[PDB]
């Protein structure tokens, strides 16, 4: 329960996760801008493209991330980008983070040209993950685990990622069995949600299709990480 390799590992990750990266100036638009399907889409695009950068900076500061193959570093980023955004947005909605402006963020998502087919599942996820009543520590560790996934397609040296992920998985279990002796199945719950997170990759590809055919444009950065061809 909390060794010296782990107490220091965690603090490095929470120090990263807490590095207030998303500019207030930017996130403030969620609240202050006009509400309409076009403006809702534009604001969400700006959040996502900014968030990708925040993700890259947080990823970089992950232990032993920079010691990886360059081609694998990209496959992990492109592979986890969406799942990481769902985690951060989830935290917004569940933790009511001031910077996120939960209720208005929800207004914008619910009117940005996203089919009910995806809206329904999306917010179902949000509700269930909230019912986990996770801590910021958990939110941070889950994000780190998702980013460092050896399942990602096109990956070459999978075992090397597994080597960076395993330690993080263990620390998370430690925070589950220790802080939650009440129910040891808590760690299994978290992992369960991860599978659920994965489902949104397909949903997201279809959301992009629909936006695209309706003449919506994304940023160079998002076009690249999402392969918007």
């Amino acid at each position: 329960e909390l060794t010296p390799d782990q107490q220091t590992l965690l603090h490095f990750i929470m120090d990263s996760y807490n590095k207030q990266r998303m500019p207030q100036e930017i996130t403030n638009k969620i609240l202050k801008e006009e509400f309409s399907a076009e403006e809702n889409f534009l604001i969400l695009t700006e959040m996502a493209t900014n968030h990708v950068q925040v993700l890259v900076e947080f990823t970089k500061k992950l232990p032993g991330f920079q010691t990886l193959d360059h081609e694998d570093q990209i496959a992990l980023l492109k592979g986890s980008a969406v799942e990481a955004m769902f985690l951060r947005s989830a935290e917004i909605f569940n933790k009511k983070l001031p910077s996120g402006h939960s209720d208005l963020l929800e207004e914008r998502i619910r009117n940005s040209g996203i089919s009910d087919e995806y809206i329904t599942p999306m917010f179902s996820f949000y509700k269930s993950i909230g019912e986990l009543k996770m801590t910021q520590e958990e939110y941070a560790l889950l994000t780190a685990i998702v980013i460092l996934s050896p399942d990602r397609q096109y990956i070459k040296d999978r075992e090397a990622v597994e080597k960076l992920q395993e330690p993080l998985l263990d620390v998370l279990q430690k925070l589950c069995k220790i802080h939650q002796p009440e129910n040891p199945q808590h760690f299994a719950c978290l992992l369960g949600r991860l599978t659920e997170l994965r489902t949104f990759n397909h949903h997201h590809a279809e959301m992009l299709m629909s936006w695209r055919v309706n003449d919506h444009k994304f940023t160079p950065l998002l076009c690249e990480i999402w392969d918007v061809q």
């Binding site: 970089k60 360059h70 990209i74 492109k78 950065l221 690249e224």
Partner: peptide, 11 residues
């Protein structure tokens, strides 16, 4: 390919 990401990683 994927130059923008390599640029952010090296930044």
């Amino acid at each position: 390919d994927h130059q923008l990401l390599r640029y952010l990683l090296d930044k």
